[PDB]
Write a protein that binds this ligand. Structure first.
Ligand SMILES: CC(C)CN(C[C@@H](O)[C@H](Cc1ccccc1)NC(=O)c1cccc(O)c1)S(=O)(=O)c1ccc(-c2ccno2)s1
Lengths: 99, 99
């Protein structure tokens, strides 16, 4: 599909039994999801953007479905105001910028 | 061009006769540049990112050439971690997400 940018590029994602709306975000190196209690090992991390840093939990090899496309990779979980699909998963679903 | 996302989508912009590197950022509503001088009137604004809120200077109707494509619009200047081109100008240059 082609997504124009007149509005926020929000799409439906699935992570286990949770469907959420997430931003397709070319400015994000990694995927950052709102607080959720995912199973498995994780590592603490700090990520920075406008306003400073937040503390997140890094989970690896988490499967996520994005508009029916399969992805699997690192997901950072923490107190972000919006679910963010970053480049680590955008590449896996075939996402490019075009102009 | 078509830009893939295995690397950060950094491009050269021209603003006020200056060349800068900026990140094409579909998760940003606004275009936010690091501290710089721009002429004309501006007004104080606050914007929010992943880490909280910051104060910026809002300049309207500023020309920027983004990878050879002309835009004229609102540019915010303040303590962003990196120069970011947001949707307000991505739309002007006809940028879409595709997968
Ligand atoms: C700043 C950028 C370099 C990294 N961030 C991604 C941005 O697209 C961000 C997304 C956003 C939207 C709405 C609320 C909060 C955030 N947008 C914005 O900050 C934003 C949103 C709306 C208006 C505005 O003027 C700015 S980011 O959110 O700070 C970020 C995401 C992943 C990061 C990472 C670092 C290491 N591994 O992964 S850093």
């Amino acid at each position: 599909p082609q997504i124009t940018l007149w509005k926020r590029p929000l799409v439906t994602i699935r992570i286990g039994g949770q469907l959420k709306e997430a931003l397709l975000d070319t400015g994000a190196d990694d995927t950052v999801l709102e607080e959720m209690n995912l199973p498995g090992k994780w590592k603490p991390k700090m990520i920075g953007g406008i306003g400073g840093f937040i503390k997140v939990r890094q989970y690896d090899q988490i499967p996520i479905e994005i508009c029916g496309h399969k992805a699997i990779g690192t997901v950072l979980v923490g107190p972000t105001p919006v679910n963010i699909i970053g480049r680590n998963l955008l590449t896996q679903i075939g996402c490019t910028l075009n102009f």
